[PDB]
Symmetry: C3
Subunit: 114 residues, 3 copies
Amino acid sequence: PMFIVNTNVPRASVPDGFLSELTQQLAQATGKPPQYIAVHVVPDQLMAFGGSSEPCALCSLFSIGKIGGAQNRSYSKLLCGLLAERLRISPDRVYINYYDMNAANVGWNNSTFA
Amino acid sequence: PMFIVNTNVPRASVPDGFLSELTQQLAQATGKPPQYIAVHVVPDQLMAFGGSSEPCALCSLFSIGKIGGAQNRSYSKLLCGLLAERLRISPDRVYINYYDMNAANVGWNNSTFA
Amino acid sequence: PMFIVNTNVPRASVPDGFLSELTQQLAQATGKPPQYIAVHVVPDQLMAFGGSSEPCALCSLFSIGKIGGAQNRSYSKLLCGLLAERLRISPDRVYINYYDMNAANVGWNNSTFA
């Protein structure tokens, strides 16, 4: 799985340990081993949410399966919880685009996951 | 909706009020309230278009519906127009990826839009 | 085609000529004219792969067609090879999301490719 968070929160406001916490919690949420979880945080971004510049986040979660209505609600509760607790972003200023990737459409290690 | 613009144009060349203009024009174009429009501008990027490092942009527009053949032509005229007028990027050096997101695949406020 | 590479490798470790090499190699691999190939490299990123902050890359390849099982395996060998040779990133620390874009969902030059 691959999780990306783009935010206007400054780099100094991203706590130590955050990439590991994301890795750990996404391994548990997705059921996939942490060795397969990739995380990316992009602070200090020029962005607006609903016409204003209070803390916000625009995010992506890609997974080969483990994507669906109930699962995505669960992911959103987890991820908005983490962004609120750790980056002080209001859950109503977070968007997460979920993608169910076909194994043949994910490259890794000179091949794909097909 | 979520609009992202990645460009090699420098930060100083992004006019004050550009995010607000994108928010307002996208609210009008998509018919969605401005409260639900998110915009993200990423200047100073290491990118090339056709092998050239002249000004260019690589963009994304995500919407839950309001995506289709004719609507995307209209969005492209609008957004290439704004990038030309405000960032001096030639329309033929802009790509915009359009995505028609399923409501169940968009997280927000600890849940999804489903 | 549009190729994006996000990496924790520092900017100084991205060799001169890299965007041109990516453009040229992707033109040959995809069969598309180099005029239509866009490339974007984002170094210095805060990211982890498998919980580790050793060199890694999270990438995207978009194309209108020329995406599929065998083609994507071939792209992955090419792109992992270039990232290993030029950025010293292990192929097993690269993820590439492949996207087969509908021509109607790609804006360019004030319209779409439909």
